[PDB]
Design a protein around this ligand. Structure first.
Ligand SMILES: [Cl-]
Ligand SMILES: [Zn+2]
Lengths: 37, 61, 48, 60
């Protein structure tokens, strides 16, 4: 049943990573918008 | 009555200054026109990048 | 007996769900990453 | 040795034109200086945003 362990080994990490990437993308959209002022 | 030689001298100096100042104005006005044009292009591309970014954000979960 | 078969089936289902989560997060991370690299290149192009 | 009245009129007109052109040049130069300053600020903030983006990508 170690397939479940290995397949889930990086779940928490990939969730944190996607959260950080999404945050950077949102901040960049806001910054780009600020350039139009 | 004026100083005839003096007003001739001033006529020539004024014409020189006017040429110099017109040229400075045209050069600076052209620089400003180019800067405004570049900024308008930048703002158009920025709008495109903002829309592409929001499209990705909307499709992503 | 049949309980070992049922628990094997449960293990297979858990592997399937874990692989689905993993591949989905890889897909998302890939799309987000590509947009971020494109944005870095665009921002850099503004400095020319 | 010239037309005195005519050179008086021409000198007055030249001075008017020079004031007008000097004012236009000074105003336009001020606008350009302001635009350059605003663009310089934008480019500084853009630099910081690029660096943060590359840092995030590097940690991922
Ligand atoms: Cl792009
Ligand atoms: Zn005279």
């Amino acid at each position: 049943r170690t397939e479940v362990e290995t397949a889930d080994k990086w779940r928490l990490e990939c969730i944190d990573v996607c959260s950080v990437l999404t945050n950077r993308l949102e901040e960049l959209a806001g910054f780009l918008n600020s350039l139009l002022k | 009555s004026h100083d005839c030689a003096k007003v001739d001298l001033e006529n020539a100096e004024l014409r020189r200054k006017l040429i110099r100042t017109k040229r400075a104005f045209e050069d600076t006005y052209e620089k400003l026109r180019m800067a405004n044009k570049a900024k308008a292009q930048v703002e158009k591309d920025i709008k495109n990048q903002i829309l592409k970014t929001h499209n990705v954000l909307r499709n992503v979960r």
